[PDB]
Design a protein around this nucleic acid. Sequence first.
DNA 1: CTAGCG
DNA 2: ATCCCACAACGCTAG
RNA 3: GAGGGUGCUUGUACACCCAUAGGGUGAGGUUAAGAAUUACACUCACUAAGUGUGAACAACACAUACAACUUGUGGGAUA
Lengths: 365, 346
Amino acid sequence: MGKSTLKHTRKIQILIDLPTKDEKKEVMDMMYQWRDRCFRAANIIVTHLYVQEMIKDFFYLSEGIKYKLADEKKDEKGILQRSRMNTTYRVVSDRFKGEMPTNILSTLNHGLISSFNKNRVQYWKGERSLPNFKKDMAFPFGLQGISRLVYDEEKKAFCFRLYRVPFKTYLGKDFTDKRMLLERLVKGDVKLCASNIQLNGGKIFWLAVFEIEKEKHSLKPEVIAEASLSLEYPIVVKTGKNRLTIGTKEEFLYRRLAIQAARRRTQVGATYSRSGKGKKRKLKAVDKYHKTESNYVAHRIHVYSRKLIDFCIKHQAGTLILMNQEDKVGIAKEEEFVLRNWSYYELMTKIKYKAEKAGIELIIG
Amino acid sequence: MGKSTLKHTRKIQILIDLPTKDEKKEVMDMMYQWRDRCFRAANIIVTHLYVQEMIKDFFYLSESRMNTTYRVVSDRFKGEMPTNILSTLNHGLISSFNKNRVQYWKGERSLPNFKKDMAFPFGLQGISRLVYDEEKKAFCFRLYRVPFKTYLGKDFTDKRMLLERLVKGDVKLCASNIQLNGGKIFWLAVFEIEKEKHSLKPEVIAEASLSLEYPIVVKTGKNRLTIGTKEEFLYRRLAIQAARRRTQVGATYSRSGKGKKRKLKAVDKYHKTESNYVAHRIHVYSRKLIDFCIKHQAGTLILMNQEDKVGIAKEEEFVLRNWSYYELMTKIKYKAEKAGIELIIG
DNA sequence: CTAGCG
DNA sequence: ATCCCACAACGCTAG
RNA sequence: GAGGGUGCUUGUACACCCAUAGGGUGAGGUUAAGAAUUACACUCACUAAGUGUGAACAACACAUACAACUUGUGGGAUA
């Protein structure tokens, strides 16, 4: 049977459920320490995953031996004294046990092993570099960390123990969307996967990953929704006698141009701003816009994709054709207008995942 | 107490000084073979130096410092791949790992792998017969028994003078790299140049003046520098002014009877900070202008008047007004006197 | 409830 | 200082 | 007055404050000067912001309309 669930990541804000500020500050320090140790652990993980592969390379080049990285107790040609995952897990555990729960290590290690296998061909070829894990990496955690999940009616928050550190969920005015997802969880009706935790400016965010089942609508395979990038208009979609134009030139280009003008002005005025304190503070105003344009354009793409998907759903379009541009049977380039290709800012990632969750068959033309 | 000699880098284009195109193809394929050998040897040396350094954390494997890796790579690629380049690379890798040892042990940075596009290094021993040829109208040298002619083309940049000083011996060369991007050979040359004692030359004339949309505009020789901008200097002033207006409006609607000082201390602070902002901005503009005058060895600084009458002026406010604004003249002349520059008012 | 291994 | 493309998001058992 | 903070995360408007925040500082390293001190587009860090009860810079309670809500880790491609 095929996979009927798609992993979705919901930002659930959790606050530390302790009375005083000293204990909350201690908890904050503990999680900051977890982040630091996790970033160091990931760097160690990937480095130790490079080194033994290049040991195999050096031995093959020196004496032509087809050494394979595996347990020597089970393999004649193996250079390893245990399983490679367990090897690098042993090194990270020996270097950082007791400062953090070991599930952070043993869910980081799996995520990095599973990726290095797929990048092995490139790494031997030489066309990719070794990841330098950031200091602001959200550390992963498994199902084993969540315990004592319970809806507390006294405090109107979902309460759980993330590794003997109690937490209440600060959903705010989200009585309908994620208060339902968590109660579907405490009752064992929805699955949780390995998640992450974010630490931004004194706030704790729970990047919980779930398994949201496919939605069942009335989709007609014969009906075709021809969405064409007349890339003047953001999205213009054809379906029989139905035409919907999603987005406007002033709505995307002009506001992103205003934010661009603000960013360039901040860069120009940053040279004579408060100096003498490094690259960070001079560029503070510029950095504020480092993550305003991305947020705005991501929201625009989310809105456009959702409106396209809804135009397909309401009109029962079972096949969404991305009609690209191909302008004038492959004629030369025109002057310009606004959105470029079908994969501009992860548009074809968003459309693909939303259509697959919605069940719409997707074809790229 | 840094090194008295500086290191500069220039990326120059180099052709093969051979008559037939087939010879060029063969030397280029050999050159790519050299690059691939350098890639493999570099990665092996880095990974195995990491292994030798951190044996105690490598307990999961089954049962000077240069020499072992150097011998291994030499026997791996002798004859097909020059030994001098190998030794220079091994020294570079070991030096880099020695520099980054602490961060390697703590886990703050993964092991830097090399790539297919990495430029292989080489010392001074590789380059031979570094001569400037007039018949071939370029700089010609024999790198590892192979002729090589550079392609500056219509290059008016500093590359020609640097190469001339290098062949003349005025500039020293360091262990450089040879790159091959898109079928073209680029020589990433690192030059060791002694920092010449910058002495002010009176023959240089440094013309500095004000403008209408450029706070300070300065001319000297063929180099142009613009100091600040209208909005750059105006943003903080307008911000202080707007803050003063809103605070005044709030105070007028605030609770009175507690003292006029308690009502207008914010206003006095705003006035003081606006004045101090203008003073600090003028001081930093003067600092930048003095640094510019120093860098180009201009010892005679003449400040243009450029006031005229009617014309385009007398209507625009002429940002920075005149040399009667917030003591620009006194600070600029004081800084010049401290630096020994000639300040002739015009 | 944690840690260990494939 | 702009902009693609890839992979992850375990699962069981023992003290 | 741009920009923010609180109103679950995001955008738009919306009250309320903060706001010279493109600012105010701290520490580490480097430099110049006889000194005061200056400099670093060098490194890292701190700091402002809703109403009520509440002695409280403790805690709790309350806090708008629309739309969005698959994110994270990494790499390769523009100085």
